[PDB]
Amino acid sequence: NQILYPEVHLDSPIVTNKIVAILEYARVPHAYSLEDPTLCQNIKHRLKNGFSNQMIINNVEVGNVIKSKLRSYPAHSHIPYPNCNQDLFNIEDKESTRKIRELLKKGNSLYSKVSDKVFQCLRDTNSRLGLGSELREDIKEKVINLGVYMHSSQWFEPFLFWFTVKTEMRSVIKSQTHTRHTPVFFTGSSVELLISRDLVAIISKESQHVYYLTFELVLMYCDVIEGRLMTETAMTIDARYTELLGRVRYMWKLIDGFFPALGNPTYQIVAMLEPLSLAYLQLRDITVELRGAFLNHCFTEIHDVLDQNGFSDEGTYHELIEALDYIFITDDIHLTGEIFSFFRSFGHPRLEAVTAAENVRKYMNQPKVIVYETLMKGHAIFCGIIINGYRDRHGGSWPPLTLPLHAADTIRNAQASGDGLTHEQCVDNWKSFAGVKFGCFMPLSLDSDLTMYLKDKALAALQREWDSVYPKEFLRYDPPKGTGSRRLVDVFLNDSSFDPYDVIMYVVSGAYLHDPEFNLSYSLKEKEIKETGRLFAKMTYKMRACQVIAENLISNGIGKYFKDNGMAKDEHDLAYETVSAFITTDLKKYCLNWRYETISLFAQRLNEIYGLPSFFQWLHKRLETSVLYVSDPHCPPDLDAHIPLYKVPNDQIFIKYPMGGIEGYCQKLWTISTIPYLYLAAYESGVRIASLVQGDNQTIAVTKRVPSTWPYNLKKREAARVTRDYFVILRQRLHDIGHHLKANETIVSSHFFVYSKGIYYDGLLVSQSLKSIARCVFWSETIVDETRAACSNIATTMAKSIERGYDRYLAYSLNVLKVIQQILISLGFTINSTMTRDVVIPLLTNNDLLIRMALLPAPIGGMNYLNMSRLFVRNIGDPVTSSIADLKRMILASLMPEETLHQVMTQQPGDSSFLDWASDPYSANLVCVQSITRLLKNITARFVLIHSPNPMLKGLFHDDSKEEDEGLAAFLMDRHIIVPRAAHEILDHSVTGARESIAGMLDTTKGLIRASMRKGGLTSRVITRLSNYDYEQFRAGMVLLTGRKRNVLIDKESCSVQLARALRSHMWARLARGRPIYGLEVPDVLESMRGHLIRRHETCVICECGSVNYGWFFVPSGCQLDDIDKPSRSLRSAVRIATVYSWAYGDDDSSWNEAWLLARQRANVSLEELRVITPISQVKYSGTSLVRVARYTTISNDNLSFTNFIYQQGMLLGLGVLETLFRLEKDTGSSNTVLHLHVETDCCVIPMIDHPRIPSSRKLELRAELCTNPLIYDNAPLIDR
Amino acid sequence: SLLLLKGEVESIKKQINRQNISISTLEGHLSSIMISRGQLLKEFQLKPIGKKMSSAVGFVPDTGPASRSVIRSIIKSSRLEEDRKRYLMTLLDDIKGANDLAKFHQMLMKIIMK
Amino acid sequence: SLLLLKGEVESIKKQINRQNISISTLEGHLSSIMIAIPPDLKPIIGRDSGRALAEVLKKP
Amino acid sequence: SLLLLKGEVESIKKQINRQNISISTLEGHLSSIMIAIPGLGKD
Amino acid sequence: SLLLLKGEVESIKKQINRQNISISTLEGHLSSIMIAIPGLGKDPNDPTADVEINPDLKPI
Ligand SMILES: Cn1nc(C(F)(F)F)cc1C(=O)Nc1ccc(S(=O)(=O)N2CCCC[C@H]2CCN2CCOCC2)cc1
């Protein structure tokens, strides 16, 4: 309670045993069956002895009420969770959902009053850019009747039902945290509903079906139905997805028809949705032998799933294949990847720990046979890559190593002459690398960084109290009390004596193999479709610290040698030419296949390079002697008494003696060990290999040289032939070390591969445009229900939808509608008890106040976080200037009154200091516009970092830090000319910026906030201030949109830049005192630019008017858009401080004196060395839908009179215009297109001051002593230039 | 000259004696570590892919229900004329033998290529 | 003085005879550990002393 | 007598050549070796 | 005839230089096998700890 709220969205797995435990302490009959009956036996044993507490009571009474209601319905039957989805995805009740229905009807009225003016604003914006005749007729009716289309969906009444149930359940939890009365069933027309703290009972009156749900199930149902509602509305309203809609709705029927009969295995079919789509994409391959390679495996898997579950008929399988052929077959390439957006539209399966334990136990206890020559050839290639990297970064000199006596003459002469090695020389002379021994040439710099420990990871309990995680209610005995801490940063920040070299000696000394308190546990992942479930591991403090230190030592050192030959991003975009094909596979179970013998030689070589005895062999030697178990609170062990972990059976939840690896924990080591075998198969196949890992996928690009006079299909078929030969050789070589490449699961293709931004198809991007639309959901994941963060999330999701190909104007309209509905939910349907009538009743009775609050931009005091210039380009320069331009566009189209502009300029200023201005240079000093969560995290992180006795934080954090930050900000900014951005950069690169970075990387979450609240880190005044912040910002908006002050200097049809200057002068008038503010304002993108479309003999009207400042775009005719064509960090910070100070505040001896005094705190340099070392004073369209036109266009800027920001955003806006013109057309038809984008910046000018030698008025206090901590200070910077 | 040859033979005897100590040390290590068609591996080999079986390298029609569905999906996803696609589905319903399915698959590939 | 090398050459012959016994013992150990591969005749070794050999090899 | 010693030296040359072949075939069997890994750690 | 033995003695030296490289190959194979497989050292101290130690560590 208090400042904390119950969670809004699902962030935890669904466990059957929780539901079973609630229904057994409630004594309600149910139809669940457990694979392990241990929990029910423990419940029966506890109830036989008469055990009770405060939690068993208040579910007996709820169960009594459920039984008394079920006496009224004689033929009742309980339906389990996977079998009731079709009943619960389509559920409605009129009487239970009256209040939210009235609120959304009011929201429909508020949007309908201004829909036509929103359309006129968008139409004027479209007509300004030159597309005045290209606006479709359906766009007007879809913008005006948006709420009618939203209320007409099939998911609207289930959305109302699940939103009502979720809100009442969160209210019950928030009220019961403070604490009572017995729950009472509420009788509707169709259902009867009981909502309790932990159980929700729904009885259908007609079918007499009974459903029991927990809190997590309610959250999951609300998320699924709201996502379906949003994406169905978006598909119905946009024309581009219309036929796509006709498939997706069918899918939404078909899988739901499988849920009453199949049950929990249905998600396995849902788990086939991500392979099958790619398989259907493989049906469009130019190599006709590769058409049905993956589809055969997918259909065999679907037939096996139907056969094992008792549904073994030929007709059912044939009808399912016909249904999938209807869903997945399409002709548009860009809509093949939209089914990817609908993976989480069916919910998540229920999980048990024993099934995942068996899945891990099957692979981690398997004998293997490994041949020696393949391992030694991979070791030789690995050594060759290390030698070539050291020659590359030390001028052709070999690393310190001793070749054996039996080495070949080629390797000996290569060492003597300092020559490199190819892969062929390493494979042919692998016996010369059998007895090599490296030297130490990699430093261990662990004192310079702190980022590895401040990442929050959970810790397992101690071994002797390994039963401390299970509650007493679910055990047949009394578990031991848990005394160990639960978080990494809690142990790390309270460590009075911490040394990373002692953490290294924990492994090197060998005490890690014999310590008594080492433990490791598994936990189920939150939101996945796999029915067995996936696990993540937690272990104790010291071994986790050793793991992160080892990963960082691999990352900062030898791993940079191996990053050069591979490519981190986009596969480097894949007479003779180079032709390539792709192999994609998954790496889910590859960690379980690793052994000590495979990784041992590579770990010895890394031990010799890093000079650490027996360090990198730590994982297998620790795990082969330790017992693993899967820890869930409702899944107890089958033990009648407390025993240690070495006495438990190898059954149920326990894995006794694993031989294998954990997911993660050696990722860079396994990658660096993986690449030599890829190069070995490349050498045996005679091809070239590029590699890329992405998510859970491995992608290998096979490249061969081909004559350029050949046709395209012959080149592609030759590439596919050498690719499948490489696949056979690679499969044999990976089986030689025992990793099971599994050719059934692997996709071999010539066009597409899967990466982060979508699917790459021969230079085309297939994106998931509707995936972010399903995340446009009321409220956000914050500890306090905040309206502004929710509106910012809505704007971010709609903008991310626009970047993947969705229509701009419909996304803007959906943003306005969702902001209106979010404001009405935040005022009228909330669990916040601080919502008093003094702000609720004036807002809810005044409609125009709500509409003007929804439409006003957020940088000037409103709630709209989506600017119109954001609809076309990612980067808007000045938020205030863009907000004023947007407001003037709303006034011009009669969307907003003119007086609101006056109400912007006569707004009451806030109270902020120079430090707040330097932290946020573009802020306009508004009232109560910050976030509660960010402020609470900053206060909590600062409190813990001051009160940490850790020796690494020796002198960075102290009680007088904030006074020092305020003094530095007042020194930088209180001058005769105020430059906020230069002060922001200098403050960011200083000690204050380092402290803010260290506090920012520390994620407090809920646990550290509760810890600081119990310890008294947060006083009661901060709690009462942040508990009423939403109420105060609604009051601030209400006062802003009410005041009657007017000035005659304010006028429309004036420059937005000058209005921004006037607003920044007025709102910052206490600190500035009339002094000028420089460097923040830029021209608006949409205001300064006008577009025109020109044919051959057509003349441009803007050029006839006399404007000659324009950019020129050309699109040729007859091109198919769908079809395929044819030093230290502190030293760098000190240099940055010196160059920004010298460039901003002038160049003189006093200026360099102050610059040296500021830069001396980061590095130990003199004034002369600092003066010497400092310097003295093709658009990127990939990754978006903008590529689809931009591969054919030509851009010239010869008529642009050269300011730079305008020069890139003009080309970006021109590409956006050309994308919007050809959005619904398959082909640029029969005529060339010329786009003129004219810039009108005769206004928007600033009197330039250049470098006017701005002096300092204050005195620079600095500090009594310099902090010599290696985190921020460089004692020996040396010279590099 | 023969006295000069005698000293070289003396140097050989020291080098032979140094080698036999070295082999004896490796004899001690290799005897403890290492310890004739006695036994066989119980199917720890990878299964080699044949021309009959389908894999990632290519699709070959075989066995029962899945291959017919894959061939029908190749007919549906192709760019052929709809009457020709219906006639090919009729011939696919006529075809029952596995070698006849392979012959039909090759013929369909030749139609799609041309 | 040249006829004094008779005992030196015989001293060499005992060293090579000692070497030939050590090679024959090494050839005996590597011939014992060979298994057939379903007649490749490749040797196989284990972790502690052939502990996986009961798990992997076929029971005769 | 020195001519009698030449027959013994050539006997050494044949004997070294026989040991070098048996060492070479010893390397061939050792280079083609395989490693068996157990399923579980013992303790 | 006795001066013809100098070519034979030099031929012995080439055979010995061929022999000890082949022994060094056997040393390289035995070193790689016995360290990648745990427990075959028979306590000589751990061969994985046969690295040199000065990576600016020096805690002891
Ligand atoms: C021997 N060989 N050959 C091949 C190939 F087939 F490509 F040739 C591949 C391999 C091999 O083993 N790859 C490999 C390499 C690394 C890992 S991983 O487990 O560490 N990692 C990547 C995969 C998915 C899991 C992820 C862990 C990430 N965590 C930590 C961070 O947050 C999210 C979860 C797993 C497998």
Numbering used by the authors:
A (entry chain A): 7 to 185, 190 to 584, 652 to 1203, 1231 to 1281, 1296 to 1320, 1329 to 1407
B (entry chain C): 338 to 372, 429 to 507
C (entry chain B): 338 to 375, 392 to 413
D (entry chain D): 338 to 380
E (entry chain E): 338 to 397
Task: Cite, word for word, the article reporting this structure.
ERDRP-0519 is a potent nonnucleoside inhibitor active against measles virus (MeV) and other Morbilliviruses. Conversely, polymerase inhibitors like ERDRP-0519 show greater promise due to the high conservation of the L-P complex across MeV strains. Here we report cryo-EM structures of the compound bound to MeV polymerase complexes at 2.73 Å and 2.48 Å resolution, revealing a unique binding pocket in the RdRp palm subdomain that overlaps the catalytic GDN motif. Structural analysis revealed that ERDRP-0519 binds to the palm subdomain of the RdRp, targeting the catalytic GDN motif and a nearby hydrophobic channel.
To test this, we assembled the MeV ternary polymerase complex with ERDRP-0519 and analyzed it by cryo-EM. The maps revealed two complexes: Lcore-P and Lfull-P-C, with clear ERDRP-0519 density on the L protein. A strong hydrogen bond (2.8 Å) forms between the compound’s carboxyl group in the linker and residue W671 of the L protein. ERDRP-0519 failed to inhibit the W671F mutant, confirming W671’s essential role in binding and antiviral activity. The central ring forms strong hydrophobic interactions with residue Y667, so any changes at this position are likely to cause steric clashes, disrupting binding.
